[PDB]
Amino acid sequence: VFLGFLGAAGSTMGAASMTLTVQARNLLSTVWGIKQLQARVLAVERYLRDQQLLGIWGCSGKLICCTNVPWNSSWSNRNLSEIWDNMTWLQWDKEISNYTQIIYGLLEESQNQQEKNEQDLLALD
Amino acid sequence: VFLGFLGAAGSTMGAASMTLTVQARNLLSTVWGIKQLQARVLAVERYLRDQQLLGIWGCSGKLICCTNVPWNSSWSNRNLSEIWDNMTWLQWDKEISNYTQIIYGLLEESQNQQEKNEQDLLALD
Amino acid sequence: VFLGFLGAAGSTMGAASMTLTVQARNLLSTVWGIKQLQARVLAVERYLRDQQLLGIWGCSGKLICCTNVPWNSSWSNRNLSEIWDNMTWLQWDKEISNYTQIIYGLLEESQNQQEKNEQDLLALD
Amino acid sequence: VSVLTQSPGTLSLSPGERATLSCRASQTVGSSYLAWYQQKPGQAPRLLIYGASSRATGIPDRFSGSGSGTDFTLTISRLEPEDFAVYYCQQYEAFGQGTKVEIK
Amino acid sequence: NLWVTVYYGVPVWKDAETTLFCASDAKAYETKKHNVWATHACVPTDPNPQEIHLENVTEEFNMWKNNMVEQMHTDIISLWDQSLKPCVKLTPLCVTLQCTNVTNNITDDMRGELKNCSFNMTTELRDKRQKVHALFYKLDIVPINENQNTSYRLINCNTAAITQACPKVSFEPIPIHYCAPAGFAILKCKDKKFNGTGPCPSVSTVQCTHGIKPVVSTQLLLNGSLAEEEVMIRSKDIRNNAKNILVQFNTPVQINCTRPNNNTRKSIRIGPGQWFYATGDIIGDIRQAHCNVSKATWNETLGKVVKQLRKHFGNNTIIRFANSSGGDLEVTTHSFNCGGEFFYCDTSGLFNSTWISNDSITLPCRIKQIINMWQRIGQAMYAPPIQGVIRCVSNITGLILTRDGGSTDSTTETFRPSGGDMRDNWRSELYKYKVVKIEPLGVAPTRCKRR
Amino acid sequence: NLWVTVYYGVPVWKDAETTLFCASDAKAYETKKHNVWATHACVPTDPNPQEIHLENVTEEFNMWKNNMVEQMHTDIISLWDQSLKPCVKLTPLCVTLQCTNVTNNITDDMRGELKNCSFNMTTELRDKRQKVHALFYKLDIVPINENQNTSYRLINCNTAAITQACPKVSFEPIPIHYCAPAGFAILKCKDKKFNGTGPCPSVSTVQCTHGIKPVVSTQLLLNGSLAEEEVMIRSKDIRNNAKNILVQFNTPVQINCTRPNNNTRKSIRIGPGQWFYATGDIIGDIRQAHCNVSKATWNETLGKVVKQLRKHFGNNTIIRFANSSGGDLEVTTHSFNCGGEFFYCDTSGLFNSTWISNDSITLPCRIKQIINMWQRIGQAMYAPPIQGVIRCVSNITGLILTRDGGSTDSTTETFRPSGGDMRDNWRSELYKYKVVKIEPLGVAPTRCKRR
């Protein structure tokens, strides 16, 4: 299970987007016993929060998930080759760290509830 | 995250069906440490039970989910405007509380396993 | 909830494939308090691991899930009637126990990430 | 306090028939707070009714009561021989005058 | 026509009972090495807390059936117990005490309260012993024998063993906020005239309750919240006399309390690592502890309370205030602790008025060191003496009263101060709070059908 | 042709070891302030429990490798330990005892069992002492010196310190049900002739085990379950003599036990809050404790056991019952506790029969107060005396036996009562239970293909 963990952290973003299962499988597992239980419970809560974020974006059971949210060049004006063939996910996260919540709020409530209401109203037809 | 929590509890059911993410994001987080750990673990188990109920209805990753279960007028004979533009979800829950398990058993086993077997047998074709 | 639990453990595999919700609903729930909390937390972690395995196979929210993985006669060369109308899931698990990880690795990484990349590249068109 | 008037002062019946003992509260606001106590001669009182209508543990079903507001009543369905005593009504700290059920 | 549609995240709730977790200021934790009511069992609070108004929502509240009060009781008692486990246990001090009167500089009121008592005591070495003297209060010592041998024993020693509070641990109530775990909400009644029961048309949901200081007191609620508009009278049943009446003031009455004696603290070694702190010698004159309240302010607040009581007992009823009929010292006097010293004030001056339908007061207070908290028999603590003169300012924000029964005449109603149970002291702050369970799964009819 | 299809929720299981949680009646918890075997660590039971018959399922059981028995052992010992932590520790009582015979009204059998013993004792004040007398049993006191000074010491005092059971805590075994957490199941063998090992063709799954009373006893299983059809003989290896044989009766033998002495309880203060309860004075005549069993019922059950033993040792073998070869008092006698008093009965009358291939019995019992439970050296407890005459009724539902080895002649087999380890007492109730892990993920071939 642990084999290959984080091994594409120095690879390009595209090369590292082909090992997502390796890092997804490694996210789940006296006074010492309660400290370790608190660590395990926090890991569980953290996994559940991430999966809830995926589920409120229409991205459940998906390691790669496309959306209807346009990319803003204000967030990043780099070209596709620069990002996917000339950058790592760590550098990317450093670059977009101050824009993450804007994207997460454009995915959270606008796109998904709009799309979901439209599917309900199309299912009416 | 907490902003807007339960703020549509006095709004109509339709107006309150547009803020579901606000209440979905607020469902996940010595001797005192074990009491609080038990509270956190029970919150996790409760969220998992709700998500399991959604998943056995074909409603995973969905805040609004349509089904193939007809509404019975015995459960409620009210008209759509009464329910969605003239009632709150609290009053609704008060009205249907003694019919919830019938609906949940018509969603649990009939609709979903029937539909799922039919998708398997159509995938055979 | 507990009613019918494991009641199709001596039935044929097909007859037992119609009661999956009964066994899915029964998988979720001082020094004694921490021992029981550790049991409950391990049950939660175990359910989450199983659901993660389902989700990395494109099988989220699904009790029956078809895949694009061909069956190998090396794993089992038995005919469909033998398996589904003349065997129980316990005997089946005894037979395939030494082949489970091969199937799980053919579902884990090959089929799902291939399919998922192809859906992304078709969504590009 | 609350004045309680428990009429009639003396009620003469015979076994097996239904007696309807009544208590009327005066200086109250009106609620379901009343109790009925049975006191046989030479014995301390015993609780029969705890509430406007409910029954104390162990008391047979022949002893039943009802009421609300400022009018309440005790209904002994069957005047068995072990049912002749003094009956009192209680509203908080106040007590009734007492009703005698005597054989006749 | 219509079909079942499943909705997750619906704003539906039910009444529930959960285990709440506190929130406290990290700031005060840096200022407070330790406080009996631990900020370590609790969590640092979140700045800028959120309160969302639930417009159009009317919720049923019951001040008298609230599990937040019971959890607070359990938590405060347990925090006290664990704060007193590490500290020294004064079992070696259960010895015969030869006591004589202290008459160095004594006023006629303070005659006999303090006694000079000599006794044999253990030392750090197990093979040697010492004779040591300490001053003790009359309320903490009992005659061993009827005959006038002047032999005395500590009051606890027969029935139990008396722990000593650690000198470093502080007693100042710091605010604690009670927060709800995930999947639970705290609904706050924003109605300004609510009596703690019945429907509340103005409701809000809060992450945590406001800061509640665990102030332990009888007959008077100190350093609490104040009514926004009018004095509030709250009883489970006002007609019932067995239920205490809780009064909330809209304007506080300032109370100034002092023990003018200049006290000293004497370290006495009773073991290898165990110390016993004693009263030492009082520098200067000895005068009784007392509390001052403004007389005009007290009279105006009493008139306001009388008006609210008349709203429940008749417009021409005579409201009489009298003092405690009897009981333990805690209930008969206004018991409180400020600065680490435990006071006991005679409030006969406070409740000495008949109100017909139409300058300061000084309360003689007494001091104790053996304290039995929370109405428990067998778990006394010794309060170490506090060095220096203590001056003390507090707000009287409410009362705890009991109405006399068996009134022969119906034109008068007598109310006497009461207390002793702190569940009726902490219910005067949590009266407007109820915990609810969120039920986020809903099913409603729609015309939409799964393909 | 065929493709992998994933199935979740398949009825597949494997053998596993988990931490089970009890279930108990809330009712009895309201009736029982405290019981050594805590109903607080455990949970209230669910009325109308479910048992689903696993038709066509044959499961392998091993009575002799079951972790439910080990968990029960751990839980019962730990519950005892925590029930005895708060209670008083009788270290001040380790003093020289001047003991003399009690001959007020003594039968020839009871001569010397009880002794009148005087000793100096601590009082609540640390500076004073008292001389107090108590009656002690010969088994609880040991001569300090060989010379006849009549000086005595409590048996534990050299090696360990002896705790005192709290007088309020009760000793009555209440049933506890062992339940499985989520994702685990308890499989119950419903075969009526099962010997605890091998395949079981009739299996059911249960939420919780039946109520099991933690009855601590040697040589005889009391208040247990009974065989449905025939007497059941269960040994790990019947040929091996080092493994105890567990016998289950199909019909119980009623046993009536009594200590006819009218006992009293004397409170002695040994500390500020610590008391020591003593035997006091026995009102009236003193007679030995004893137990009665019906002789005809015992003989018929012994014949049934002989028949089942003949099914394992030959059809013409002589089955002889004899009494214990030796050991500690617990194993040599039928040890049990009923009412709070610990009995020790000589079962030589019970096992005094030779069975060739073709009115009541009175057992002289003895009483003790220093009890070393569960074969542990160093953790003795003092049982406070029980006031009044105690009468006691129990069902003998089984036996614990050991077969004699080295038989020179092969026509006879001798079986002697045994015990001491309660893992063989609690394994006679959990013999039909095994915990399993559910494996809900399955993969099977189908012709269906993901689009």
Ligand SMILES: *[C@@H]1O[C@H](CO)[C@@H](O[C@@H]2O[C@H](CO)[C@@H](O[C@@H]3O[C@H](CO)[C@@H](O)[C@H](O[C@H]4O[C@H](CO)[C@@H](O)[C@H](O)[C@@H]4O)[C@@H]3O)[C@H](O)[C@H]2NC(C)=O)[C@H](O)[C@H]1NC(C)=O
């Ligand atoms: C109601 O609230 C008022 C106002 O908050 C409160 O009065 C305050 O009490 C505190 C704590 O007793 C007082 O502070 C003490 O007084 C001085 C001022 O700094 C210091 O000498 C004290 O520190 C000593 O004690 C500490 C241990 O507690 C040691 O850590 C330290 O080293 C010192 O030895 C201490 O801070 C404060 O002065 C008053 N304020 C007023 C205006 O009176 C009152 O106690 C509350 N009432 C009740 C009944 O709870």
Ligand SMILES: *[C@@H]1O[C@H](CO)[C@@H](O[C@@H]2O[C@H](CO)[C@@H](O[C@@H]3O[C@H](CO)[C@@H](O)[C@H](O[C@H]4O[C@H](CO)[C@@H](O)[C@H](O)[C@@H]4O)[C@@H]3O)[C@H](O)[C@H]2NC(C)=O)[C@H](O)[C@H]1NC(C)=O
């Ligand atoms: C096998 O089962 C039988 C039947 O269940 C059992 O015998 C029963 O034991 C109980 C408990 O020892 C007996 O009840 C006691 O006897 C009387 C009857 O009410 C009371 O005096 C006792 O109460 C006193 O003690 C309590 C503390 O235990 C105190 O709380 C209380 O205030 C009293 O001081 C107590 O209830 C019961 O009478 C017998 N029943 C029969 C038919 O013998 C037996 O003990 C079990 N055997 C074994 C070996 O476990």
Ligand SMILES: *[C@@H]1O[C@H](CO)[C@@H](O[C@@H]2O[C@H](CO)[C@@H](O)[C@H](O)[C@H]2NC(C)=O)[C@H](O)[C@H]1NC(C)=O
């Ligand atoms: C309490 O009595 C003690 C005697 O035990 C007094 O202590 C003595 O005080 C005198 C001064 O008058 C000193 O010379 C002695 O040395 C002290 N005794 C010892 C043993 O040192 C003490 O003054 C009295 N305290 C009060 C407050 O009256």
Ligand SMILES: *[C@@H]1O[C@H](CO)[C@@H](O[C@@H]2O[C@H](CO)[C@@H](O)[C@H](O)[C@H]2NC(C)=O)[C@H](O)[C@H]1NC(C)=O
């Ligand atoms: C608090 O206010 C409420 C609402 O005004 C009072 O409830 C009324 O009184 C009784 C209960 O005592 C019930 O009949 C109803 O719930 C209310 N009646 C109405 C609105 O007609 C409640 O009594 C008040 N409590 C106090 C102590 O003042």
Ligand SMILES: *[C@@H]1O[C@H](CO)[C@@H](O[C@@H]2O[C@H](CO)[C@@H](O)[C@H](O)[C@H]2NC(C)=O)[C@H](O)[C@H]1NC(C)=O
């Ligand atoms: C409480 O009130 C009393 C009575 O007014 C105050 O006692 C006076 O205090 C002042 C200031 O120290 C002295 O000059 C007076 O001589 C005192 N008068 C008396 C005893 O009649 C006392 O200070 C007040 N205590 C407080 C506010 O703690």
Ligand SMILES: *[C@@H]1O[C@H](CO)[C@@H](O[C@@H]2O[C@H](CO)[C@@H](O)[C@H](O)[C@H]2NC(C)=O)[C@H](O)[C@H]1NC(C)=O
């Ligand atoms: C309580 O009030 C009574 C009067 O109702 C006070 O007693 C009177 O006090 C005044 C003023 O000191 C004296 O002139 C009277 O002679 C006292 N007796 C009577 C019968 O009026 C009493 O002092 C008050 N108690 C307090 C403040 O504790």
Ligand SMILES: *[C@@H]1O[C@H](CO)[C@@H](O[C@@H]2O[C@H](CO)[C@@H](O)[C@H](O)[C@H]2NC(C)=O)[C@H](O)[C@H]1NC(C)=O
């Ligand atoms: C055990 O011996 C003690 C002596 O220590 C006896 O107690 C004395 O009994 C006599 C009556 O014969 C009383 O007058 C004395 O007061 C008792 N002694 C004390 C110190 O009070 C006791 O009777 C003996 N017990 C038995 C069972 O024989």
Ligand SMILES: *[C@@H]1O[C@H](CO)[C@@H](O[C@@H]2O[C@H](CO)[C@@H](O)[C@H](O)[C@H]2NC(C)=O)[C@H](O)[C@H]1NC(C)=O
């Ligand atoms: C319990 O019954 C089983 C089944 O009858 C016995 O198992 C047989 O005996 C031995 C093990 O002792 C093994 O060869 C087989 O498992 C079984 N043999 C068969 C069916 O031919 C088991 O011995 C019995 N145990 C006791 C104590 O009677």
Ligand SMILES: *[C@@H]1O[C@H](CO)[C@@H](O[C@@H]2O[C@H](CO)[C@@H](O)[C@H](O)[C@H]2NC(C)=O)[C@H](O)[C@H]1NC(C)=O
């Ligand atoms: C155990 O059996 C003995 C012997 O039968 C019983 O002792 C008899 O008890 C009765 C009733 O109290 C007495 O009248 C007899 O005198 C006794 N007979 C003797 C000593 O020979 C004893 O009661 C039984 N104990 C029980 C059932 O607890």
Ligand SMILES: *[C@@H]1O[C@H](CO)[C@@H](O[C@@H]2O[C@H](CO)[C@@H](O)[C@H](O)[C@H]2NC(C)=O)[C@H](O)[C@H]1NC(C)=O
């Ligand atoms: C055990 O059995 C033996 C006999 O096998 C008993 O001893 C005999 O008891 C009878 C009847 O009391 C006497 O007549 C005999 O003289 C005894 N001796 C022999 C050699 O038979 C013995 O009492 C029994 N033991 C018990 C009940 O503990």
Ligand SMILES: *[C@@H]1O[C@H](CO)[C@@H](O)[C@H](O)[C@H]1NC(C)=O
């Ligand atoms: C590291 O970078 C080199 C060239 O920059 C590349 O060939 C190699 O594959 C990279 N390895 C990993 C593990 O990213």
Ligand SMILES: *[C@@H]1O[C@H](CO)[C@@H](O)[C@H](O)[C@H]1NC(C)=O
């Ligand atoms: C991109 O972000 C800017 C702010 O930096 C905002 O004004 C603009 O509207 C955004 N563009 C889109 C398409 O949302």
Ligand SMILES: *[C@@H]1O[C@H](CO)[C@@H](O)[C@H](O)[C@H]1NC(C)=O
């Ligand atoms: C993102 O992070 C910092 C911190 O706010 C921000 O000031 C900065 O402009 C951003 N950095 C980059 C490299 O874009």
Ligand SMILES: *[C@@H]1O[C@H](CO)[C@@H](O)[C@H](O)[C@H]1NC(C)=O
């Ligand atoms: C409350 O109701 C009023 C009218 O009934 C409506 O205008 C308003 O939007 C509602 N507000 C909420 C928060 O539901």
Ligand SMILES: *[C@@H]1O[C@H](CO)[C@@H](O)[C@H](O)[C@H]1NC(C)=O
């Ligand atoms: C509606 O419920 C009633 C019972 O109230 C039942 O008889 C009827 O069949 C139900 N209708 C449908 C369409 O299931």
Ligand SMILES: *[C@@H]1O[C@H](CO)[C@@H](O)[C@H](O)[C@H]1NC(C)=O
């Ligand atoms: C639902 O709840 C109660 C409780 O069973 C039931 O009797 C009643 O008919 C229902 N109430 C409403 C308002 O439909």
